[PDB]
Amino acid sequence: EEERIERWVEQLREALIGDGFLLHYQPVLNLQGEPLELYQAFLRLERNGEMMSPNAFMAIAEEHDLITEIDRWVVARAIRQLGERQRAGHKTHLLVRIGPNSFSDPQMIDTIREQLAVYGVPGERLWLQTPESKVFTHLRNAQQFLASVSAMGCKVGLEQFGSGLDSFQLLAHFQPAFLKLDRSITGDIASARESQEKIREITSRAQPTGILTVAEFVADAQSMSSFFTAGVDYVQGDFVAPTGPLM
Ligand SMILES: Nc1nc2c(ncn2[C@@H]2O[C@@H]3COP(=O)(O)O[C@H]4[C@@H](O)[C@H](n5cnc6c(=O)[nH]c(N)nc65)O[C@@H]4COP(=O)(O)O[C@H]3[C@H]2O)c(=O)[nH]1
Q1: CATH number of 90's domain
Q2: 51 strand-pairing partners
Q3: Which residues does the UniProt record annotate as the domain EAL (predicted)?
Q4: Domain span including residue 35
Q5: Residue 245 to residue 56: CA distance in whole angstroms
Q6: In contact, 77 and 97? CB cutoff 8 Å
Q7: Which atom of ligand 1 is nearest to the CA of 237?
């Protein structure tokens, strides 16, 4: 045990150089969103001859404090693809994950600003999501971070929102551009009752501030209609379109 990790933590620190990392994307179709090109970005690793999923190493990168490094790698990689798909005339928008330790990371704030500029990519195309739980904690930083990146026109949103009470509490203290609905509420509206009304106490509340909304993980047409009645701007999940490397 003392060993396997040592091989992982090394190979990772390599993909952080001349990499081995790569990104798969997932279509984010919109109903109320009417209608832009958007994909959530997902990190893949080229260990040996096959492709690794963050379920194979994110744990490691955690204890060794390499997430900041990686997630800066992810964002910079997204901003590149944005330059590429834009120099090609596509105005593709990318949803990218940012951990909590990045709210204070300047190299992040600097890697966003510089790249975003060097590719002629207007920040508006870069959407950054992160759990509300991680925000309810690393707040102060996640506070100024918002401002830092938001100034460049980027969009900062919450992932897994609506779970616990304080969910609506953070709103009056934070201020996201988009809300990725928490699965504990999403996956069940076809039957679930309180949830039916739930994504309304949320939807109808976003419309005012203009806070977009994304119900992800959708896995059936039945619930697909449900979110339209709700007024959920965007939908994501294997049922709409799985994740893939292609664009
Ligand atoms: N969020 C989301 N996922 C969907 C959906 N439909 C299918 N999935 C799949 O289910 C998995 C779980 O994603 P997760 O909860 O964010 O949990 C993720 C995440 O914690 C981590 N991860 C993967 N890529 C990245 C990345 O680029 N940045 C960061 N910070 N973490 C990543 O690895 C876990 C597994 O990722 P994957 O192998 O890519 O596998 C993903 C994804 O391919 C959907 O609508 N929404």
Answers
A1: 3.20.20.450
A2: 46
A3: 5-247
A4: 1-247
A5: 19
A6: no
A7: 45
Is 44 known to sit in a ligand binding site?
Answer: yes
Ligand-binding annotation for 43, yes or no, is: yes
Q: Please give the number of the atom of ligand 1 that sits closest to the Cα of 44.
A: 24
162: Cβ–Cβ under 8 A, 6 or more apart, which residues? 179, 181, 182, 184, 185, 198, 199, 202
**How many structural domains are present in the chain?**
1
Convert the chain into a string of H (helix), E (strand) and C (coil): CCCHHHHHHHHHHHHCCCCCEEEEEEECEECCCCCCCEEEEEEEEEECCEEECCCCCHHHHHHCCCHHHHHHHHHHHHHHHHHHHHHCCCCCEEEEECCHHHCCCHHHHHHHHHHHHHCCCCHHHEEEEEEHHHHHHCHHHHHHHHHHHHCCCCEEEEEEECCCCHHHHHHCCCCCCEEEECHHHHCCCCCCCHHHHHHHHCHHHHHHHCCEEEECCCCCHHHHHHHHHHCCCEECCCCCCCCECCC
Place of tokens 């102060």: 140
Is there an atom of ligand 1 within 6 Å of 194 CB?
Answer: no
In 10 A of CB 127, how many CB atoms?
A: 24
Method of determination?
X-ray
Ligand 1 contact via 71 beta carbon (within 6 Å): yes
User: Does 125 belong to an annotated binding site?
Assistant: no
Resolution of this deposited model, Å: 2.5
Which atom of ligand 1 is nearest to 236's Cα?
A: 45
**Nearest C-alpha neighbor of 185 from the set 172, 170, 200, 171:** 200
How many CA atoms are closer than 13 Å to the CA of 149, on its beta-carbon side?
Answer: 33
Q: Which of 16, 23, 42 most suits a substitution to test ligand 1, by most atoms within 8 Å of the C-beta?
A: 42
